Design a protein around this ligand. Structure first.
Ligand SMILES: *Cc1c(COP(=O)(O)O)cnc(C)c1O
Ligand SMILES: *Cc1c(COP(=O)(O)O)cnc(C)c1O
Lengths: 363, 363
């Protein structure tokens, strides 16, 4: 023994509506590609930035679906979208550098930022404003130390989808003040209304687009993510991978290739899931409204932030009360969504009905 | 844009005998377990420290095969042995802390150490001493800033196997001076003569044992590693995983479980590979001797460090000459094995014969 490092010591330590992954299993066409890979002996080390075939397909995906002008060399395959974010912050942050985070935010953002020595500068997003950021508020938080701004749309945990105008405004601030715009787009296919716009169309040399197969193809356990952006940053990210994970699982990389190239089979899965989620969202929202429980209507992902005022004075107490009632929910504390609890509708309509029933018994 | 971080900027940028992975494909019993996992829908997120079933099997493995007294909670599954090492250094090193590394060393050790802010203190290992460390030399490099000492046996790239007495001496220094002993044991099953001793038997609260399925079961592309040691360090390591990779591939975790529980099928693979490697080693060594090329006889792994004095004045030039001759070798520069080139015998005997033929044409 000797002692743990400071960075590690500074880290923050029934019907369930807490899921952060699809209830659907990964589509058969992807499972098949994995089986073929095993049979073909695709079990050796892959390059740090990923199997070239995948990087090629990734360039086509970002260009075709997102309108991004990228080359295969400006693409990288990682161990989940989480490692894409982690490697990114390790590659661009020096201790002291600031990163603007829009609250409510995904729990992991501030963790990853601080682990690299960065300073988290939180900019609040309001319920009454539909949880869409106000570029003016963001403009006020910019300082000479600002290294990056994190944008996540469709958003976790709000479910909000930022309109193109806002995304363009934020991209302009990055160019204007010379910093990186980190765009987390993993929920792009879980969109019920509106359109998914990619900021990188506007500021390609400032934007690092993070995505992955996780939520879109029900591949959370496969651990395959991807990102694109300025070649020098992508290269730096591959360097961090070389010294940590070496490269993602080779079998999972070949399976993901199938998910991207077999557009027909994947499209069918995406449409099926989206329609299923939409039904669940509507069902949930109607029930909450009927009970007089406030919640901003989500347009993407499979989350809903519910105001817990009528349940208890704070999210923690509210989460406990609902637990007593037989409903597991995620308190919004760690998301900086105080007075709110996060509901996930990636479960059966039956479970959603049972939860609503319980909610009523609590009121 | 804005700029890359200092830590990333400070990173160091035909018959082939350069392989760092087995030429054998992963055994069918492991492939089967993976297929069953897919069929059973084991595709969701796993806990950060790994699937509990695997951690249980890991405790049995370290205890049964290595004589280590560990509990499942003092076990962790990572994305390759490389991430085990990476997370470890991120969890115990503060900028300035020193880490003793025995040269020749595996290229990645100093990279990972510096990335965490540590200082690499290199202690030389001599050819004439069979590349086995001298505890006295190691004792001289210890300072009040020493945080850890890295030991790798069987060794990459030397192939040396350290005798129990030496391992015990090094473990004693760690207790005596109060620092961590990092023992990289991934090549334990690729042993031709002698016995594999685990330092952790002597100093359990000072030793972090790193291992993995990579070289032993020809699973380099599956990316599954594991380690055991002091509960607080293991816990810290799981925390780094939570904020980076989340958890290793779920399918690969279930496949690895089979490799550890089906001792019969795995033992058979290990014995087959070991016998194949032994033959190749002997063949290679005889040929080198016949040509008058010096090389310390390896007892483990599948590497051989060859003295390039008769080929050229330095490894780089020697590597180039051999390349012209149609033989790809790894120059020992990055291993701190100057005047030497690293040969890998994880190929067919035919390719080894062809390489020897070429070597002759060069002399
Ligand atoms: C799922 C998710 C990610 C990345 O997930 P991986 O499972 O690691 O691919 C990143 N951000 C948010 C908001 C997510 O929901
Ligand atoms: C293979 C190896 C490792 C770890 O490899 P993984 O493929 O990441 O499990 C660590 N040290 C040495 C010397 C190795 O040869």
């Amino acid at each position: 023994m000797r002692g743990l490092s400071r960075r590690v010591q500074a880290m923050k330590p029934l019907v369930a509506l807490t899921a952060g992954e699809p209830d659907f299993d990964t589509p058969e066409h992807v499972k098949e590609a994995a089986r073929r890979a095993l049979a073909q002996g695709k079990t050796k080390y892959a390059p740090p930035a990923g199997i070239p075939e995948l990087r090629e397909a990734l360039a086509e995906k970002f260009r075709r679906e997102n309108g991004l002008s990228v080359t295969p060399e400006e693409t990288i395959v990682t161990v989940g979208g989480s490692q894409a974010l982690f490697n990114l912050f390790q590659a661009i942050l020096d201790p002291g550098d600031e990163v603007i985070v829009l609250s409510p935010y995904w729990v992991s953002y501030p963790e990853m930022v601080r682990f690299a020595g960065g300073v988290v500068v939180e900019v609040e997003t309001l319920p009454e404003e539909g949880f869409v950021p106000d570029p003016e508020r963001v403009r006020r938080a910019i300082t000479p130390r600002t290294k990056a701004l994190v944008v996540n749309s469709p958003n976790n945990p709000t479910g909000a989808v930022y309109p193109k105008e806002v995304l363009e405004a934020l991209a302009r601030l990055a160019v204007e003040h010379d910093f990186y715009l980190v765009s987390d787009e993993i929920y792009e296919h879980l969109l019920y209304e509106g359109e998914h716009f990619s900021p990188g169309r506007v500021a390609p040399e400032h934007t690092l687009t993070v995505n992955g197969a996780a939520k879109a193809f029900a591949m959370t356990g496969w651990r395959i993510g991807y990102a694109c952006g300025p070649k020098e940053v992508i290269k730096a990210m591959a360097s961090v991978s070389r010294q940590s994970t070496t490269s993602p699982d080779t079998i999972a990389q070949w399976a993901t290739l199938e998910a991207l190239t077999n557009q027909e089979a994947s499209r069918a899965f995406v449409e099926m899931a989206r329609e299923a989620y939409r039904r669940r969202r509507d069902l949930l929202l109607e029930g909450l409204t009927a009970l007089g429980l406030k919640a901003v209507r989500p347009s993407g992902a499979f989350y809903v932030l519910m105001d817990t005022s009528p349940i208890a004075p704070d999210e923690v107490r509210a989460a406990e009360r609902l637990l007593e009632a037989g409903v597991a929910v995620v308190p919004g504390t760690d998301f900086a969504a105080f007075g709110h609890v996060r509901l996930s509708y990636a479960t059966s309509e039956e479970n959603l009905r049972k939860a609503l029933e319980r909610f009523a018994r609590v009121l």
